[PDB]
Amino acid sequence: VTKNLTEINEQAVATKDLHDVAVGDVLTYQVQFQIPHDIGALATFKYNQFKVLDYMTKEGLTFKALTAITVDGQDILKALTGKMAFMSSNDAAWQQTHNYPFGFELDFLGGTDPDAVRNLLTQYAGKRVTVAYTGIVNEKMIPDQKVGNTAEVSFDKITVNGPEIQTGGIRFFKHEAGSSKSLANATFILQRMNGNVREYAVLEGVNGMAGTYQPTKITWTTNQDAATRLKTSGAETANLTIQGLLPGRYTLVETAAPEGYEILDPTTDFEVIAGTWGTKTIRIANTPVN
Ligand SMILES: [Cl-]
């Protein structure tokens, strides 16, 4: 049995055991295993269960869809749909059945029509079958945490672990020049260079948030006026934080100082460090003028 993360946002990615992800990313996984050569055999059938359980013990992914079940280049999901047993972590029964924040269980022979399913699998006896599915990186995917999954295949088991995923974040502390006084209501936008194209962050799911940003998705625009205006809180230690970012270079661009202040540093260049909140909370001064 194998498990791999094969795509991010429907683009193929290189196989490795650790991937950096952004919040809102759609991750494609594949779990592959062999149909027994004697899947069709009489013992009354020898096989009455053919189960795939896939789960994560840590938060950060929401189940999206079972996308394909393929063998020998043939997608057989259309033929199998409605005949099998299936539950995911989106279903109300999941938590009490399998106490994990993410996962699914597919029992090829546990549904209403196991004979039909067994007959189909018998056409591909001894061949490798791939179950593909997607998940969505959600607002509970926090930095400083590598999270992985486990798949188990059983006929009454074999277990494998998938790759780990992680995300980045950053913290700033906007303050009055010369002191540690927290300044609320400074306005920033988040900028990056994607190749030679300057782009700005659009955060979904952050209406009503200030200071702490925990978006459900981050996309990028070349229309600067469409960028989400991020606001500092008056909090003590870090009054602007963002999570769910890919590693690399960014610029925090100050578009308005708080009332009674002027901008000192229009641009703050910084790095997101893969999988972490970064080296330190980045202090940014504003100049008092009242
Ligand atoms: Cl930039």
On whether the CB atoms of residues 52 and 105 are closer than 8 A, the answer is: yes
In DSSP terms, 65 is beta-bridged to 134
- Residues 172, 260: Cα–Cα separation, whole Å: 20
Ligand 1 centroid to Cα of residue 194, in Å, is: 8
Ligand 1 centroid to Cα of residue 242, in Å, is: 16
CA 183 to centroid of chain Cα atoms: 32
Ligand 1 centroid to Cα of residue 21, in Å, is: 19
Instruction: Classify residue 95 as exposed, middle or buried by CB count within 10 Å of its CB (0-12, 13-18, 19+).
Output: exposed
Question: In the chain, where are the structural domains located?
Answer: 2-166, 168-288
Give the number of other Cβ atoms within 10 Å of residue 175's Cβ: 18
Q: What are the angstrom distances between the C-alpha of 251 and each of 24, 41, 281?
A: 21, 63, 15
Ligand 1 centroid to Cα of residue 196, in Å, is: 10
Fold match between domain 2-166 and domain 168-288: yes
Technique employed here was X-ray
Q: Would you state the torsion angle of the CA atoms of residues 97, 100, 104, 109, taken in this order, to the nearest 10 degrees?
A: -40
Ligand 1 centroid to Cα of residue 6, in Å, is: 29
- Residues 20, 266: Cα–Cα separation, whole Å: 29
Assign residue 78 a region (left: φ > 0; alpha: ψ between -120 and 50; beta: otherwise). Answer: alpha
Instruction: Classify residue 239 as exposed, middle or buried by CB count within 10 Å of its CB (0-12, 13-18, 19+).
Output: buried
Ligand 1 centroid to Cα of residue 204, in Å, is: 20
Ligand 1 centroid to Cα of residue 233, in Å, is: 24
Ligand 1 centroid to Cα of residue 239, in Å, is: 21
Q: What does residue 115 show for φ and ψ, rounded to 5 degrees? A: -65, -40
Give the three-state DSSP class for 30. strand
Reference 36, options 98, 125, 142; nearest CA is 125
On whether the CB atoms of residues 283 and 237 are closer than 8 A, the answer is: no
DSSP per residue over 244-267, as a string?
EEPSEEEEEEEEEPPTTEEES-SE
Ligand 1 centroid to Cα of residue 9, in Å, is: 23
Ligand 1 centroid to Cα of residue 175, in Å, is: 23
- Residues 177, 285: Cα–Cα separation, whole Å: 5
- Residues 132, 4: Cα–Cα separation, whole Å: 10
Q: What are the angstrom distances between the C-alpha of 218 and each of 116, 249, 256?
A: 44, 16, 22
CATH number of 168-288: 2.60.40.10
Which DSSP symbol is given to 78? Answer: H
- Residues 230, 190: Cα–Cα separation, whole Å: 8
CATH number of 2-166: 2.60.40.740
Task: Record the resolution, in angstroms.
Answer: 1.5
Ligand 1 centroid to Cα of residue 219, in Å, is: 15
Ligand 1 centroid to Cα of residue 225, in Å, is: 16
